[PDB]
Design a protein around this ligand. Structure first.
Ligand SMILES: [Ca+2]
Ligand SMILES: [Ca+2]
Ligand SMILES: [Ca+2]
Ligand SMILES: [Ca+2]
Ligand SMILES: [Ca+2]
Ligand SMILES: [Ca+2]
Ligand SMILES: [Ca+2]
Ligand SMILES: [Ca+2]
Lengths: 318, 318, 318, 318
């Protein structure tokens, strides 16, 4: 069989995942959502596009988890976004029940899948999805860091006037105030950003502003669109993860991953650089922090611990 | 300079055009729409995706036509869709004024552009846009037939269980009842569909049903999505046209094109197979019809004439 | 595991196969040849290229068949070319012994492979390789027709001044005088070549000359190079076949395939259009001939029968 | 017009350049060499391959410089390789006269070209070609460092078991003993190699061995092939440079480039990281050396000075 990718959620990110998976000839695609219509429509629309570039891929839409059977990769975008007038607790409340339903469908019908979560709040939902589904911890990851890395690379490539291919961004942690950037492990052509300031290729103030722009990057897009959130960069980010699994590329990508003692952490999903191959999360790359970074990381992990406490307070199973 | 593609309309088709143009490294992209926000948001979101695959392209959003200056290709999706409760005349009424505004921006700021129209009703709006803009008739085309061809190829590839790469669909005219398919010039690996029925690879009833499904294909997607229309296949179709221009590929593509006496028609835009290269519409391929086809084509051109009469009745300039 | 492609023969076609397989991210590659050195050198050179486009593929060279173990696809270019001063019988003599050795390595170490033969004379060597290896007849094919089709498409695209993407060539049989072209099933945008002559897009004499140029096409390249034969088009042709297998594309490609009664032939490999998918040769497309074509096909199959008789006369096992 | 790439030399690197340029749809290709036959044969063979992937590109072969007229990029591989029994002086002697002839053809017929030299010894031949041709110094570069970088990235990706996409190698200078690697500016996912030794991901001895393997890398391939030198990695390397020019990507690539005082050097071609865009060499990235590196760089520039002295001693014009 060709590889099979199931997409749980057929909204703007889901649709974009499905389109990218066709264009990149990754395999056959099933779009799932709770109500018939949109999944089947988007599937057929992309199927109908396929003769133009010449990709051969089966597309279907479904509202029964049986349709995801034997999926090699599952990408989860199901759930609601954070509104103008709802608490973290009500978001967690609604989206945890979504994760329970999703996790039970994956458990029954695609237990060998590599699962990529992109439901918010990410570090909590992926932890929950793994627990609900029972899948091996190395087979469930969250997409976050690749997106922050992609935005920071864009800003850096702009600032230096160089190709996006020759910029590297090193981030850990989560988004926003929970992001932990290491500008010393971010580079142009191998030269750290910290050294580029010393060369006069940029300034400290410009560098700090790009880091802050990365922190704020999701909101920046929300403020422009007014309705809805980013979807092109989030979808490309998750597809990079999926492709590394499917093609056993062993990319090193910052992802929310289950820590078994790496970074001094046990039993939590945290944004860290991981090797993704055909066996899932194969290795975590644990860097050595300076003081500012250790303090930033600890703050960010405390934020995650806070979220998990809130999940547990609203769900017996967790 | 890299090539410059301006996209007039930043809705679902526009966004998908912009994403495809990046992925295919066609050049820099300007998204235009009447109100700031969405164009700039989608532009930045796609820009931010770019480091993941490594495409180098400038993206921007704008609400001033000055931003399209010197565009090599302009793709127009501006305007409103046909509603549940509005007449052809009110659609034409609203969208003609859109074409006047668009045509004046192209005239002033990208007079050398190759222009691809995807505002409805297509055969009328492209005719109008050319008239309003004053651009050479060979430099303004409408996207329609490639989309019908793509849907019919999908259905055929399904039916025969063969690659989408080895199916060819021949269509002329417009969509729906105005489509003029030639199943005898549609093939699998060079073998006409009419001969595949004789071989027993399909049946006449199945073939007729695929032709009818192609006619109904846009509505099929609308019925599934419930809100909004197809956008992946329409965007891929227009990008194939744009790429043929930009790369001087000389693809032979069914497009709404200005006829200077080909097919016995003068002064109308009609869906015909055209060679698209760096000089725009370079040649029209005028096939020889059988009787059923000639009658179908004449009906379809009468429908176009009807539309143009309606345009003229609601606009002095036309 | 990633897919595994073994290439038996590390000459110019083999090297080009290996390069294409990397660029197209088809999987890991083993280059085999009888003497160490060249396979390992070409493998390492391509491996070393890989960081430039970013393909992840393992490359190795070997002179032991154990190295091909579990290959998903095997492509055979081993053997000698026809010289200025050697008979068909001495070519067959030398290359049959090559096929025996190759077939025994495939039998032992990659019995589930899809095997693509490109040792001359093609219709005989593939028949022999299948017999020596014992693999299922649907899992062993010869590359020939795709190459003739590719050359004829190039000539046609030149003549009409249109994209190579919009030309289809229909050929059966073998090369040279054994080729059986059907110009009526060859098209530009679905319009048969026979109809393009009637439209004045070309002439009968030009069409006949392109058919003859296709027949002579391998020699044309030999006359220019002076040492050695074509290798880019032959390698691209075989990779199209391999990709259809690996990605289950179900391309319809003219290939030397084992006939179980199709075209009225039993027990011979003949150039025919076949559906290639994950199960190998899945279906043969048997067209209906006109008189000239039936006579051409019968002549061409008699030529194949002649070759097989010659093989049998020089090998007990056959 | 499509972009035009002229390839001066139709040997194994030239052929591979031509194939890559087609596959990557960079433009039309002219293969030049001194004797008719091989250029025209390889051109036609690649042209004939093109329908298989669907690239539209004109290919031709020529032995008159008029055929390169208006080339946007010229890639020079003409000349002889260093033999088992010839001196540096006889190599320089023969290949300087080649550069004079090439430079005069470029001067007359493609004076606006971006020129990429890959004739040995590289740092001298590119300096000579620029002088003979009279083209702007920012429009003539040599391919060397990208190749060393590509080989070192391959070795590193092997050693760490990670994707080639996530490794960066920083080299300056020339090949062999004249290479100046900076392992501290070489990274996996932004983490310097020096830090990966501290993490235990590799060892110092392994790192040193990969650096030495990079130095010896061209000879390693020569020892395996026995006849001829590497060609896949050299061709991919030069195409990356050409693509950055053609698509205005502003890649940062180590290339032999004319120094106007950067790195403390005036009037010499030296391997340094340069920004390549539509204006040629746009900026040199001048890093800050530690002591070991400064001494290595000075040794390597003294070697270049030695070569240039030898050129001047055998040519009045220089
Ligand atoms: Ca393809
Ligand atoms: Ca530790
Ligand atoms: Ca690239
Ligand atoms: Ca006529
Ligand atoms: Ca990639
Ligand atoms: Ca039969
Ligand atoms: Ca194409
Ligand atoms: Ca300086």
């Amino acid at each position: 069989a060709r590889s099979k990718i199931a997409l749980i959620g057929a909204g703007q990110i889901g649709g974009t995942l499905a389109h990218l998976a066709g264009l990149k000839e990754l395999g056959d695609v099933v779009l799932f959502d709770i109500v018939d219509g949109v999944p089947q429509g988007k599937a057929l629309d992309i199927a109908e596009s396929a003769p133009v570039d010449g990709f051969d891929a089966k597309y279907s839409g479904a509202s029964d988890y049986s349709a995801i059977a034997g999926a090699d990769v599952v990408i989860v975008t199901a759930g609601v976004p954070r509104k103008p007038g709802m608490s973290r607790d009500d978001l967690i409340g609604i989206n945890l029940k979504v994760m329970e339903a999703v996790g039970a469908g994956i458990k029954e019908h695609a237990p060998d899948a590599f699962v990529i979560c992109i439901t918010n709040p990410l570090d909590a939902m992926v932890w929950a999805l793994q627990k609900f589904s029972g899948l091996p911890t190395n087979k469930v990851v969250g997409m976050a860091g690749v997106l922050d890395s992609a935005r920071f690379r864009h800003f850096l490539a702009e600032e230096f006037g160089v190709s996006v291919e020759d910029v590297t961004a090193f981030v850990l942690g989560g988004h926003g105030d929970d992001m932990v950037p290491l500008t010393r492990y971010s580079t142009v052509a191998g030269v750290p950003l910290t050294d580029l300031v010393k060369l006069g290729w940029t300034t400290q103030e410009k560098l700090d502003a790009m880091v802050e722009r990365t922190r704020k990057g999701g909101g920046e897009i929300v403020n422009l669109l007014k309705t809805g959130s980013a979807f092109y960069a989030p979808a490309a980010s998750a597809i990079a993860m999926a492709e590394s699994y499917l093609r056993d590329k062993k990319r090193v990508l910052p992802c929310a991953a289950y820590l078994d003692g790496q970074y001094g952490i046990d039993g939590l999903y945290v944004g860290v650089p991981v090797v993704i191959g055909e066996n899932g999360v194969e290795r975590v790359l644990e860097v050595t922090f300076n003081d500012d970074e250790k303090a930033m990381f600890e703050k960010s992990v405390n934020s995650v611990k806070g979220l998990i406490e809130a999940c547990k307070s609203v769900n017996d199973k967790l």
